[PDB]
Each structure stands twice: as C-alpha cells, then as structure tokens.
Amino acid sequence: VAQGPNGRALAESMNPDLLSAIQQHISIERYASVTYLAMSIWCAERELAGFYQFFDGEAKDEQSHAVHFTQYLIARSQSNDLQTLDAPRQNWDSLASLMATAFQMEADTTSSIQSVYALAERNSDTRTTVFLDPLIDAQIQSEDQFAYLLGRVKFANGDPTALLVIDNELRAGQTQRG
C-alpha cells in the first residue's frame, strides 16, 4: 500500500495540477464566505435586517462548502494548503449593486468548480467528477435563487417601500421562487 502526500494510505494518485486547482477552489469558497459576511454587514448598516440575516447564513454555508472540499482532499490522501485570504469588497452604492456582485460571486464560484471538473475529466479522475456533481447541482439552485433576489430588488427600482417589503420577505425565510 502506497502513502499519499498527506501521509494516509493512497487509493489512487492525483495529478498535481488537479490538486492545485482544488486547493485554489477552497480559497474561492472561503472568499465567497467573507464576501457574504461583508455584504451582511453592509445590509445591517442600512437596517436591511432580512438581507443581513440572509447573507449571514450564506457566509456560514460557503465556509461549510470550503470545509467539505478540505475533507475530500483528506479522503484522497492529498495535502491541504490553506491560503492567504484576500479582503472582500466592502462598498456598494445601492442594494441593487450589492446583489449584482452577489450574483457574480455565485456564478464565479460555479465557474471555478467547472474548471476543476474539466481538469478532472482530462485526467480521468472519476472520483473528483462524482464528488463535484452534487455541488454543481447545488450551484444551479443557488444561481436560480440569487437571480431571483437580484431580479426582485431590480424590480423595486430603488423604491425604499419595495425594498422594505423584500427585506421582510427575507427575514421570514422567503428567499426563492418556491
């Protein structure tokens, strides 16, 4: 039995470029987390309590995704390399602008997973494509959800009254089309 780079018994070796791509993707999930924390704060500063609660939860969920990836590297007997984390964006001129950045962050997270997926396919790493499949499915749902929240905020067209109504929807847990 061979030993993997992290010292555990090795079921099958992993291409170093694929390993590097997964380590970088963990940083993307961690960066999404701190970005949603920054967004939660921006909303709290403007008394948008439902948006604050929503993004507070999204921050925790993205961190959970990051940990899920670190566990996959452990399972593959590969080394983890937790990286320096950039500071998030923290300033927006409007809730609509913030929600556009949020949607872009979600779509960019999917693009990162897609890049890992394509590298796994080039390397015939079926364990990794199987691992990523349900994460892509979750991303479809999250993109659908963020398009819904962004579109509803844009429909409000900057009217504070409409934004208060949507804020109360989010506080109540009404965060997707259903």
Contact call for residue 22 and its own copies (CB under 8 A) = no
106 among the known binding-site residues? yes
Q: Which stretch binds Fe ion (CB under 5 A): 5-13, 42-50, 112-120, 125-133?
A: 125-133
Cα dist. 14→76, 113, 116 in Å? 8, 17, 13
Question: Nearest Cα to 176, choosing from 155, 156, 152?
Answer: 152
Site for Cl ion in 90-119 (CB under 5 A): 90-91, 94-96, 101
Site for its own copies in 137-176 (CB under 8 A): 137, 139-141, 143-144, 146-148, 150-152, 155-157, 159-166, 168-169, 171, 174, 176
Enumerate the β-bridge partners of residue 3: 9
Residue with tokens 């990794």: 128
Contact call for residue 109 and Fe ion (CB under 5 A) = yes
CA distance 49 to 89: 20
Q: Which stretch binds Fe ion (CB under 5 A): 6-14, 93-101, 114-122, 140-148?
A: 140-148
CA distance 30 to 36: 10
Q: Which of 15, 24, 123, 127 binds its own copies (CB under 8 A)?
A: 127
Question: Nearest Cα to 27, choosing from 108, 130, 133?
Answer: 108
Binding site for Fe ion (CB under 5 A): 29, 62, 65, 106, 109, 133, 142
